[PDB]
Design a binder for this molecule. Structure first.
Ligand code: PLP
Ligand code: PLP
Lengths: 468, 464
């Protein structure tokens, strides 16, 4: 009778298994004293080596899971996880995943989702209301930021080809003769998905012209102007600009308004990469810091970085829904997607808004913005810490200065902090120099928590200088 | 900040988890048919009564009853017999509950730790089942579509690196001769192939459809003749996509003989096994996938034939160095995604908890049940059947304009909600479709769905 299948017969076996994991996760989460254990990949691989997947009930697998996974997990909920763009998650997100695991709707078509199809559209339309895109706009949920950025360069590429080579559609015929000339402009601090996407699209990293940044690490529009004009004097064709409203390392917001004027003047597609920055769409006071986003031709948004939603939760938005035609009364969302089978990720944003306010999200995001201002204060205050910027969002790039030696010393500080497990820090190269990075996404993290991690950073730094 | 999942909110997590278990038990118990029949414009009339700017679980879940659960398509229900939406196994739900709490992103060791290694464990195992050689590797993806984009990306980029020494498309974009490159697939191949080639900048034109057999397997003598015709136009054969389980017919292209042709031309062989991967765990049916081991890449969907929740898919290559085009155990060096969830836990827990043998037992039953559904379809004088089931699907139509009658049967059935059936188009004619992914569908269910099909059809002709 195939006892393993979710159905009416198995509802009691489902709820008891769910009861066991709550007991196991409750004990696990209560005994988390620190964000990581320090274990090294080779140390952990030792315990994987004699496991043989061609071979115990839930209780036995979960006992083994305890050791292989939970023991050394990176705990993003812990206040001292201040590394990459991994947010703590909110309860209505887990509420949604639990339901989603039972129904397993596929939201590519109405006939595999029903109300899931309409719910996604609601979340999308609500998002578009916050961005301020005009009437005929639309969007779609994707795997995340990377696939949204692919869809953005795909549409820029294909829409340009349709307006400049009369009914020569890339979809059918591939790339026209003059594609090798097309150029996309992005900040040197843009996410690498842009370049990866142009590889995939058959134009290569060479189609991307990196544009210098400001002294506040924002893309310099004077330098963009210069790049577009140098490009026009080589016979090359400017096609698009990627503006990043929250760079991954600096949290810096490119000047949206200025970029959008340059774009229109040269007929270019404006894509706003908001994967991190989209958190400001829910801030009572900070929302104005994204002004100029309403002008974009497309927008990428990650709810799984800045809206405390589990992975995957992210979406891609267009100003004009007709451009989505390059990717394709029954509502079938597959017509706007580059995936086929797709999970009901929108339930997460749907149940979050329904249960928790939208203002509950903004309150959190605001608290993390104010906390980062405090960390910038504490970092700058320190004579041994060199800070590069005042936080435009939730991230702070800094280093310990007691060149190729200062690089060694900071890369060893991060490795030590990691091995100690007592906090998780991230790293970045800025102009070929190793910096350390703090990204703040937990609004329960306090002043005292940041103080602790700073002391750890300077302990291990002084340890590199002084040796113990 | 009360709503953040952490140590202080664990009791609230547990209380809400119990709420959903109560709500879902009630709901699934009262599911008496696979769908309600509601139209989109109908359910929409309720949805606009919701303002997303305007506050607890209990109220949210009460609302969710009418807007989502009420009219959901229930794939567990034995009279769901439409597309490839499998019931789901309990260890898959086990994995999801944990995944939600921990939320690792398995693109990097520093955002998942053991998540990274567990994934590499499930990839190695699937690899052993496929039988690719030593330096093979793979990666979880969002699904078959992305997996097939990966296939065609690698066939494209590897071809160029090998023929245009030190011209990597990664950097320079498409080389001079690329508008000549051609990929060959069956006419019953999945549309993700053409879509990938559009993305890749080569276009639907770069795909050459190949005629199929009397059993809807691609015909290697027609493949030969397409390659040879392509050569004679001076275009460049680069890849073949074999489908070890076509979406519509469940037919398996002849892997053995396609591989011999590819190797003779130095083409890339992709096996799209999104559906036909289920055979990897079957005691006795595995040999029908023989030849897969000769592939340069493979697509597998755990969310189609392994009873895993969406998303659960993977991409496999014979030679790992080809994953260099897409570029501490960091799995992102082999992906075209960045942030990516721990879908591999579903497969890990399923294998740990249930037998790999308990997956094959279920798939074997569904394959048996499809042979009976074909007998019952063939027996009916009003039903025309096209094929003996190579897998789990059966394409057929009601033959008492005939295209119009069958298209209206599928719709009438969906509107009754007593069953859910699919449909498809072969040689410009409209056919209906059964696909059987539920071990608990009985003969009597299949007999019930045919009578519904015949009743609505007779209503088209007669009018009553
Ligand atoms: C600005 C920006 N864009 C794009 C991405 C890629 O996002 P994802 O990991 O969700 O695919 C990231 C990370 C990011 O910080
Ligand atoms: C469904 C399917 C695909 C696409 O996979 P998704 O998981 O839906 O993206 C590819 N190939 C075949 C044979 C399929 O049946």
């Amino acid at each position: 009778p195939h006892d393993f299948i979710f159905n009416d017969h198995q509802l009691s076996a489902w709820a008891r298994q769910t009861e066991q994991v709550l007991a196991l996760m409750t004990e696990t989460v209560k005994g988390v004293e620190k964000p990581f254990s320090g274990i090294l990949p080779h140390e952990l691989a030792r315990e994987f080596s004699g496991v043989d997947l061609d071979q115990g009930s839930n209780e036995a697998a979960l006992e083994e899971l305890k050791k292989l996974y939970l023991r050394d997990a990176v705990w993003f909920h812990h206040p001292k996880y201040v590394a990459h763009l991994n947010c703590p998650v909110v309860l209505p997100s887990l509420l949604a995943e639990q339901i989603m695991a039972a129904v397993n709707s596929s939201v590519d078509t109405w006939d595999q989702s029903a109300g899931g199809t309409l719910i996604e559209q609601k979340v999308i339309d609500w998002t578009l209301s916050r961005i301020g895109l005009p009437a005929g706009a639309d969007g779609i949920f994707t795997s995340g930021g990377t696939q949204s950025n692919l869809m953005a360069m795909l549409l820029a590429r294909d829409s340009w080809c349709a307006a400049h080579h009369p009914g020569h559609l890339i979809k059918h015929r591939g790339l026209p003769h003059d594609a090798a000339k097309w150029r996309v402009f992005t900040s040197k601090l843009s996410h690498f998905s842009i370049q990866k996407s142009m590889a995939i699209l058959g134009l290569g990293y060479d189609a991307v012209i990196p544009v210098d940044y400001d002294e506040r690490y924002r893309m310099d529009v004077d330098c963009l102007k210069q790049e577009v004009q140098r490009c026009l004097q080589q016979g090359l064709i400017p096609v698009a600009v990627v503006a990043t409203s929250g760079t991954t390392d600096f949290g810096s917001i490119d000047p949206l308004g200025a970029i959008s004027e340059l774009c229109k003047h040269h007929g270019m597609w404006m894509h706003v990469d908001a994967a991190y920055g989209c958190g400001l769409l829910v801030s009572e006071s900070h929302r104005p810091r994204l002004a100029g986003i309403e002008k974009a031709d497309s927008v990428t948004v990650d709810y799984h970085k800045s809206f405390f939603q589990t992975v995957s939760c992210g979406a891609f938005f267009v100003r004009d829904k007709h451009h989505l035609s390059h990717v394709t009364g029954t509502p079938n969302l597959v017509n706007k997607s580059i995936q086929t089978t797709r999970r009901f990720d929108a339930l997460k944003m749907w149940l979050t808004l329904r249960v928790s306010g939208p203002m509950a999200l903004g309150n959190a995001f605001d608290d993390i913005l104010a906390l980062t201002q405090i960390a910038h204060q504490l970092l700058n205050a320190h004579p041994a810490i060199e800070v590069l910027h005042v936080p435009e969002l939730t991230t702070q790039i800094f280093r310990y200065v007691p060149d190729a030696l200062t690089d060694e010393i900071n890369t060893n500080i991060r490795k030590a902090v990691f091995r100690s497990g007592n906090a998780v820090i991230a790293g970045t190269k800025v102009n070929g120099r190793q910096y350390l990075k703090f990204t703040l996404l937990n609004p329960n993290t306090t002043a005292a928590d940041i103080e602790d991690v700073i002391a750890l950073i300077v302990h291990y730094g002084r340890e590199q200088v002084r040796g113990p």
